[PDB]
Subunit: 258 residues, 5 copies
């Protein structure tokens, strides 16, 4: 049902935004961090506190109104993580690596994820432990079974609320997202080094094999992210997730559709 | 089979294929039994629930032939989009895992991993290789028959079809590069105690299944076979015991109709 | 606004420079090093010394003024850039902590950041802090009136890289929302044991042209180079750690471009 | 080894398939694919490694169909190796952490195979040409190995005396020899060495990857006296026994080589 | 000025490493590493200091025609020698095998029509270098960053310590160079061999290094990592580098 790209004056636009991370924000002073991790809980008695759980970030961007078809088509995205050099602060609150040494860098398990779509990101739920008791204010797989630990097709959600869908509960659903592009990399392990690139010269092309990008339903663009950079280690040895915001610059064109 | 032109017609099929890590009880779906070792190659009797197995599913397709004469039509697998499902579940460092140190978070899943998928017009063809030819494998497993010391390198007697779900242990079998004329397979083994899992998800990645002559796997008996193994690494309990953790694999296969000579 | 490339005799020029690192320079013998790192300062009492904070390096390169009174502008088309002295890290005999009894010195290793930019105006920078309550020392330029939101994205923290050895690397990143008139490239690798990995070759050129074939255009006849090359931490025999930095070379090809006024 | 005439005629294709066994030392009948436990000399002056402790290059010569009815003709035909598909066989066998392995910690699983590894193959129309290089020129190598003759301290860097054909299976120690880049005009070789005690093995399998054997002029290895030469070394790393002893583990390598008939001057 | 391409020739060289060679039996190794307690008392011994390798390769005299270097094939020689874990090795644990060569490494080559141009940079300007080494003259604290005084030609084999000198990106108009440094005590060596890999030496204008006084210069440094003795002492290990260079005749005026 996709016809010609529409050219003419005002047939192209670009939108930009910064999406803040949602790492748990355990107090008024620790925006961008989670609560300290509390660990070794039997699978039968696993009740994570809300502020310990990083969640997916999401925002809707309104686009100039079109007449109902003409739709905005997302063609490219430029994206990077904002503030990566903040991790060179080894003087603030971090455990000394040895006597007389500097602080321990942020490191360990990390996840870097973004999506651009013409509708909210479609998610599939998978749990480490289907018996986890998730706290009020989170949205997690509803009424999970043992099969929820591998693949349970009942756990479908839209990423339709910021700071609500825990990263550990949800992945982008590859059986859906017909009208979105998503990219993520998970790296797990205690000593994993964060590796992050910035440049204003890199572009991701969002067109499929037929040269069609995401088409923006009701003239709205949806951006999604999760940038868990790794764990911060306090002098006590406690560990907290650290997250950073993500920048998006999306170029769109008008597309004719039936 | 003499392959003629593409019939201009197209369908997509999809499958979420569950991993078969052993499933030691009703609550540990996706995990193996704790890993336990024989002191010796001569007394090596692994329990069934400790052995991850290859996953496989048969996707039935409709017959395309009005007449069972001359030229026939077969379904041809052209592309696959595939992804491991639930990679973010490893960000749960609060459930059951050993502290990395006092007052620290849980130990991440890490260690030896294997990520493998195949798409074929017939069951995956496999070649047996053993770490230890004297391993005594348990009832419910299908493992190399009458193994010899040569079974630890290459014994051409060990040929099998991946013809049963949750029966062929990953440690005993590999895709056979000498066969699989009618399938495409892809795997990476990463070995070691502290190996970081590195997993990517994107709906922009497509594997083309066409060979040098532009022919994909042909569904000879109107069935398509998807095969997987996704051992993500070892989960370490508070106690120090270790268990394999596996994740489901999604498949989306584009098929077209291919004319062939009767 | 942007028109024809002025093609002709005298229409091209190459400029080169070596930009020194600004790692803190704690005394005149330790040029290229920071002061030893402090640690475990509660977030509420974190007052880093100036000499402990590596800063962005920057130079303004004046170009011939092509305008008496349509205008002509210098356009940056390519850059060749290299970190200088990477082999110095093979010196494991100067003041190293031994890796064990009878063993060699501990190499420089750990968190590193390799960054450069070429632009026709100062680099546009965005402030982000590990700890908004950090009290930065005199002679540094850091986010003004920071809040908890400064630990994520706070759009108040916009600055020009307009002073050498003033903008701490830990406080500032290139702003992806600006820098229309510059090209920047950085990689951050974090961790205690990260191996430095550095390449040299005189066969690598970066094209600075955007999609419409236009390079950075030198406003007020100035070319701006910027860098940060934190190689990792040097560990003394005492066990103290210090940032080590190296200089960065730039060779930029420029051409004359016609623009409208 | 299977030699299949895929096509007859001027556009004849022959596919040669084979599985080359590793030669890790095989210290007893039950430990096929392993070396003898590694033992280190105190120093360079009394370094006498045991035969079964030294992995060796694998090689085989595959005879091909005769092409030339008239040995008298102005032109003769040679088999030309155009492509190879290759992979290491049994990589998943390293997921066996239950057999004979050292616990990683109390109550933990077995230690995986890991550490220094070398993955190498060659396809040629004559034996692989090798150059000798030694860690320690004063090593006394055991009966059954072929190692550099009358080595000097210059043998620890480059000694042009140490030239050899890989002309015997399970005889040329991997630690003594490398492919010679000054020769091998009629072979293609590929190898990666990764050193260190915690190095993770990383091995890929696919039936979709083809290496093209043609040079810049579009010419593959030419099989002299109707002979195709395969060579390999696949040291996966070290297996650690419950005792703490370490042995090399090796795996077999599959080859599928596609050959065509090339006319050359008699 | 470079005119038309005029036929072809090939030269090859096995260039030995210069790791220090602390005695007649330890060719390809350095002296054991020692550390000064302090930057003010840093006097390394000559045999402890790996140096750049170089060789001048004489070319057929012509006649202006000049030899132009078009492609190079290069390979580090003897990488499998590191599978010897039986010779003088420290055990990784009780009953375990020997500790492999690992740690900081540098792999570098250059092909030019004249000697390689170098820039000096020091970790420690106050280092006192020994007789037989050529190191930056009148070093200052600026020698730890960029000091434009420190220019040299790689004109002597086994004289210019790797730790004092880099290729000069502001010069070398008539050479191509390539180097990777990987730092850290547990870095694994990763080395590839193949006779299918060629580096083209032509610039964007199609011109390769032109050989002055009918001479070709090859330069290398191949520090593979540290060898650990059973005592726990550590020595650099180096390996030879092969070069095969294809050259064509070029008319100058
Ligand atoms: Cl749900
Ligand atoms: Cl069997
Ligand atoms: Cl500000
Ligand atoms: Cl010899
Ligand atoms: Cl000098």
């Amino acid at each position: 049902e996709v016809l010609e790209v529409k050219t003419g004056v005002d047939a192209i636009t670009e939108v930009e935004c910064f999406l803040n991370p949602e790492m748990g924000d355990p107090d008024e002073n620790l925006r961008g961090f989670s609560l300290k991790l509390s660990a070794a809980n039997d699978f039968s008695s696993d009740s994570p506190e809300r502020k310990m759980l990083p969640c997916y970030s999401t925002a809707r961007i309104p686009l100039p109104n079109l007449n109902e078809l003409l739709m905005w088509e997302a063609v490219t995205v430029q994206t990077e993580v904002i503030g990566i050099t903040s991790m060179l602060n080894l003087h603030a609150g971090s455990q000394k690596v040895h006597e007389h040494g500097g602080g321990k860098p942020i490191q360990g398990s990390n996840f870097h994820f973004f999506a651009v779509g013409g509708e909210p990101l479609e998610m599939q739920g998978v749990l480490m432990n289907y018996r986890s008791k998730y706290p009020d204010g989170t949205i997690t797989p509803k009424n999970p079974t043992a099969q929820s630990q591998v693949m349970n097709t009942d756990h479908k959600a839209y990423l339709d609320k910021n700071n609500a869908y825990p990263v550990e509960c949800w992945v982008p659903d590859p059986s859906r997202n017909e009208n979105a592009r998503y990219f993520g990399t998970f790296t797990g392990g205690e000593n994993v080094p964060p590796v992050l690139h910035v440049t204003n010269t890199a572009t991701t092309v969002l067109l499929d094999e037929q040269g069609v990008g995401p088409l923006c339903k009701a003239d709205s663009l949806y951006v999604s992210a999760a940038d868990i950079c790794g764990l911060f280690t306090n002098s006590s040895g406690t560990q907290q997730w650290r997250g950073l915001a993500r920048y998006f610059k999306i170029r769109l064109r008008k597309r004719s559709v039936k």
